[PDB]
């Protein structure tokens, strides 16, 4: 029941000029030819999403990716300033397999309705985890994994309001974001189905009602305040950062307004960073919403959360634990 260094693995193409593919070629090995998935019968082991080392490993690997592969022209910190060159490149998330090292293996809870902390009835050991697209997003979750059975809620403590609440989507909700060329290039927009989103939101509301018995008809609202990275739906699309306003979602064809920001609050450290002007023409990005990051206002009223990308990796690495062979 120990922990050690893992190594990334992905079926990356060495000839493509997509940023992710470059770093993968020279920092991650190809995929395992034969997948060794063994189902252990009558095994009970306690998993813990939040005190897991795999999350910090994935966090560290991603940090290096963005730096070496999506570099900022001007970085800003209270103490220091660093100026450098940032060449424009393409950027489309690819899947990454985080394999366990020779001598160790990963235990996998193979039941959808697993809360995240506690014993698992059915556990299966696999040598490599499944491909996890490393998408950095705020508020919303994108290109993620869907819950097989039904929507699931996960958190360290429903009693403590400060702790974030993570939700895994039931059916992938598609969102199609584009900045069309006419003028003012910042103005953009995302489009999302109104009826589909309303149904998914009602489903999450029902799950939250199950968490808090009496089922006080609750309503969602925009984040109170703070830096715009957590208040607004932010995500990287086509190499340019988009800060889309999620005011319509939390309350026809819903359409959100977006704005390409040059300066943004970087999540690697405590500081700011600036990037070059935007690309001139059509930018197209269509992703599958597969969950959300929400927090509870004390007093139930819920507001979007996020900002700390470690939770996103927990959402994807919740059923996986690294242990030693016997």
């Amino acid at each position, epitope marked *: 029941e120990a922990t050690t260094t893992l190594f990334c693995a992905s079926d*990356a193409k*060495a*000839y493509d000029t997509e940023c992710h593919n470059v770093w993968a070629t*020279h920092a991650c090995v190809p995929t395992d*030819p034969n997948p060794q998935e063994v189902v252990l019968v009558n095994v009970t082991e306690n998993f813990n999403m939040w005190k897991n080392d795999m999350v910090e490993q994935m966090h560290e690997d991603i940090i290096s990716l963005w730096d070496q592969c999506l570099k900022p022209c001007v970085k800003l910190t209270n103490t220091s300033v660093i100026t450098q060159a940032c060449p424009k490149v393409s950027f489309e998330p690819i899947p990454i397999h985080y394999c366990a090292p020779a001598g160790f293996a990963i235990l996998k809870c193979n039941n959808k309705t697993f809360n995240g902390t506690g014993p698992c009835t059915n556990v299966s050991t696999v040598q490599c985890t499944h491909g996890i697209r490393p998408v950095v997003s705020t508020q919303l979750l994108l290109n993620g994994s869907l819950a097989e059975e039904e929507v699931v809620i996960r958190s360290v403590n429903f009693t403590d309001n400060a702790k974030t609440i993570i939700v895994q989507l039931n059916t992938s909700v598609e969102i199609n974001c584009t900045r069309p060329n006419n003028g003012n290039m910042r103005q953009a927009h995302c489009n999302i189905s109104r009826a589909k989103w309303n149904n998914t939101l009602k489903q999450i509301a029902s799950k939250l009602r199950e968490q808090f018995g009496n089922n006080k008809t609750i309503i969602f609202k925009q984040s109170s305040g703070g830096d715009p990275e957590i208040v607004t739906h932010s995500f990287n699309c086509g190499g340019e950062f988009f800060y889309c306003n999620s005011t319509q979602l939390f309350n026809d064809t819903i359409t959100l307004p977006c704005r390409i920001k040059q300066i943004i609050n970087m999540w690697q450290k405590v500081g700011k960073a600036m990037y070059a002007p935007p690309i001139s023409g059509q930018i197209r990005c269509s992703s599958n919403i597969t969950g959300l990051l929400l927090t509870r206002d004390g007093g139930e009223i819920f507001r979007p959360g996020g900002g700390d990308m470690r939770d996103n990796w927990r959402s994807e690495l919740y059923k996986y634990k690294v242990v030693k062979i016997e």
Partner: antibody
Amino acid sequence: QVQLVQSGAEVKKPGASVKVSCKASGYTFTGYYMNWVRQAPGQGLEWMGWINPNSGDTNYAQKFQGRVTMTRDTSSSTAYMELNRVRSDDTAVYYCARWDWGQYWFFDLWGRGTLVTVSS
Amino acid sequence: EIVLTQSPGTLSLSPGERATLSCRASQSVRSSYLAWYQQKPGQVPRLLIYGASSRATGIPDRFSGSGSGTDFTLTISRLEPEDFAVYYCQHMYTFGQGTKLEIKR
């Protein structure tokens, strides 16, 4: 007896297509990646591509993308590589290696080598 | 756009003296994806070291690779007349320019 047997030397003209075959006998073919490396006469090594024999997904370098096509035959336990638009720069000795997926990257087995000569 | 530059270009040493070949990479390369091969004139390259600092199966003990980060080192103590050959530094897909070694006379 656990050998990587390559084809014989070939002589080609400018613009033709060259195909060298690397047959592996003695070990499980599907379980290990097959890599293709070439060395020009008196120069350093250069990795060209590899192929996953189990699933058949291939990978080539930018310098070769478009004109190199790699195939494998599970029945006869062989792996063929084809290179189009041959040029005098392609004259080299092509080796094939076998890497079993693992933490570390290394070429354990090496083929005897195939000599491809391109000239007018 | 990663290139491994092997130094020195051409090393000259006599039997019995420890020689150290250095292989520098532009970008900070992973720690365990590095290997070293030896190619004797007119033979297939032989696998000496893999994983930066680990002798492959059967490689003599005198060989020893070490170093992490952008700078790596391949150390050979007690040079014997057979070890004088070409040495190459490989990180995954990118090979080094090569290091030619000569017997001092």
